[PDB]
Amino acid sequence: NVAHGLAWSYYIGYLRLILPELQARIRTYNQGAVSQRLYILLPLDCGVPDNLSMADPNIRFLDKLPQQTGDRAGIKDRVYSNSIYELLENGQRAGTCVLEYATPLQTLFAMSQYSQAGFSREDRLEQAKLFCRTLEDILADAPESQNNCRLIAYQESFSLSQEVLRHLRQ
Amino acid sequence: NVAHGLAWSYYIGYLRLILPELQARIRTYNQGAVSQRLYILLPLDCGVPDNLSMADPNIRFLDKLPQQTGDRAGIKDRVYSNSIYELLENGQRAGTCVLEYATPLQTLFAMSQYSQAGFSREDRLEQAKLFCRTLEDILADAPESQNNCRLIAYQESFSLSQEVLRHLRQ
Ligand SMILES: [NH3+]c1ncnc2c1ncn2[C@@H]1O[C@@H]2CO[P@@](=O)(S)O[C@H]3[C@@H](F)[C@H](n4cnc5c([NH3+])ncnc54)O[C@@H]3CO[P@@](=O)(S)O[C@H]2[C@H]1F
């Protein structure tokens, strides 16, 4: 239903555009090294806090990648930026990677709360699971995703940093 | 159907966020003046060229507004930028305004071409008309839209610059 559209919008408007020019931006920042893949958190509870340092203290913002720009729909130099986070484990730099949330989930949440949107608060977990399934099916035959993307879906004590680290070691 | 989701995504992810901080960015650039409203082109043929200077030569890029940033879904300083265009009429500066296309239309087009998206090329005109209707209904009770937004839907000789100018003089 609704999630299907957002997942294609999330691919045609973002992933399809920044994933090709992604390793260049990492190989540029590198010159502890950063990992070559964009890690997309996919909480099925649709809990997307803007500050990534609140879901887990062991997730530390480090720096930004070099910006990417592109004229898009009449906006000269529309710019895509991505935050580099390092993940701690017992006070130890255990990883470093470009980590971010899948914004469309935050939209599904913020969309349900509105009355005029006709979107129930109970469907939030199904649309999330439909957003991940539709997204992973897209990336499954995505030439833009030439092994440079890692989807991290999860539900909920819990350690998000351990969840990202687990996918890092692979 | 699909367009309904994109229109709420287009409001919760963009309009709801930049429209409040919009007049400040204009009143800042001003200090020929720029108009206080964001003008959103809504072509029902879903023809959204990235370079706005191609649909009409009398639409001239002028400058960018001051950027807006906000931590969004774990991206430190995600930045929203908006291009200032001036519109010519018989080689005469006839207007100046922050003019842009509604990117989700460009998505509906680029979404139809994919086979895995299950979106026909014939539904493109209905989903466009559903995107405008759903969007204008949102802005109709949008406190964020305190008379600072102007929707410009149109179909197709034709002069886009005349179409924007017509809404400017009101
Ligand atoms: N500056 C700028 N200019 C014009 N339009 C903008 C815009 N900022 C938001 N919008 C409008 O909002 C729609 C939905 O926005 P939202 O955020 S809820 O979801 C996005 C997001 F998930 C992802 N995305 C793209 N850039 C990203 C960056 N920097 N960081 C993280 N995510 C990114 O792509 C989805 C769809 O993007 P669209 O462009 S197809 O439609 C977008 C677009 F119409």
In chain A, where the domains are located: 1-34, 35-170
Q: Counting beta carbons within 10 angstroms of the beta carbon of residue A121, is it exposed (0 to 12), middle (13 to 18) or buried (19 or more)?
A: exposed
Interval between CA B94 and ligand 1 midpoint (Å)? 31
- Cβ atoms of residues A48 and B73 within 8 Å: yes
Q: Which of A11, A69, A75, A86 to mutate to test the interface with B (most CBs of B within 10 A)?
A: A75
- CB-based contact, A115 to chain B, within 8 Å: no
Map chain B to HEC letters: CHHHHHHHHHHHHHHHHHCCCHHHHHHHHHCCCCCCCEEEEEECCCCCCCCCCCCCCCEEEEEECCCEEEEECCEEEEEECCEEEEEECCCCEEEEEEEEECHHHHHHHHHHCCCCCCCCCCCHHHHHHHHHHHHHHHHHCCCCCCCCEEEEEECCCCCHHHHHHHHHCC
Taking the C-alpha atoms of residue B116 and residue B133, their distance in angstroms, rounded to an integer, is 27
- Cβ atoms of residues B44 and B132 within 8 Å: yes
DSSP state at residue A11? I
Q: Which of B4, B6, B8, B85 to mutate to test the interface with A (most CBs of A within 10 A)?
A: B8
Is ligand 1 within 6 A of the CB of residue A64?
no
Question: What is the experimental resolution, given in Å to one decimal place?
Answer: 3.2
Is ligand 1 within 6 A of the CB of residue B79?
no
Cα distances from B131 to residues A103, B84, B94, B147, in angstroms, run 20, 24, 30, 20
Query: Among partner residues B61, B77, B104, which is closest to A9 by beta-carbon distance?
Result: B104
Give φ, ψ of B23 to 5 degrees. -65, -35
What CA dihedral angle connects B24, B147, A115 and B154, to 10 degrees?
Answer: -110
Method: X-ray
Shortest CA gap A33–chain B (Å): 19
Query: Among partner residues B9, B64, B107, which is closest to A12 by beta-carbon distance?
Result: B107
Strands (E), chain A: 38-43, 59-64, 68-72, 75-80, 83-88, 93-101, 149-154
